[PDB]
Amino acid sequence: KVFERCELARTLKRLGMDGYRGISLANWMCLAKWESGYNTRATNYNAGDRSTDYGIFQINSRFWCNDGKTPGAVNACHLSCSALLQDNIADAVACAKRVVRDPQGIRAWVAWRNRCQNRDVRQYVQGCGV
């Protein structure tokens, strides 16, 4: 499903993402925006290393979820990658909290460094009443 902006902000808020491991909701919103355009069915295959990025947060199949076809898969979220293509994002959120418990935190997603780090990101949550 493609979320509307404030719709996603309140859903993430309800699921405990605001200030999770010090990360504001606006930073999580900036990340989903640039990773998938808030689209839960987004997939991106990475031909160079044979892995795929799944869902609204574009979580990768080498380290986090298992799709069975990625070389060297670790499956740290202990989740099938199909769980990240559901309309309900509760599993994607539980795996995203797992990613940022690593020292790197949200810096684990390159797109957050390129488009969100050291930028004003308050516009992603403005007017959502969150």
Kindly name the residue from 53, 91, 102, 120 that is annotated as catalytic. 53
Residue labelled with tokens 């020292």: 103
35 is catalytic: yes
Encode 7-72 in three state secondary structure. Answer: HHHHHHHHCCCCCECCECHHHHHHHHHHHHCCECCCEEEECCCCEEEECCCCEECCCCCECCCCCC
Neighbour tally for 64: CB within 10 Å: 25
Gap between the Cα atoms of 31 and 117, Å rounded? 10
91 is catalytic: no
Kindly name the residue from 4, 7, 35, 87 that is annotated as catalytic. 35
Active site residues: 35, 53
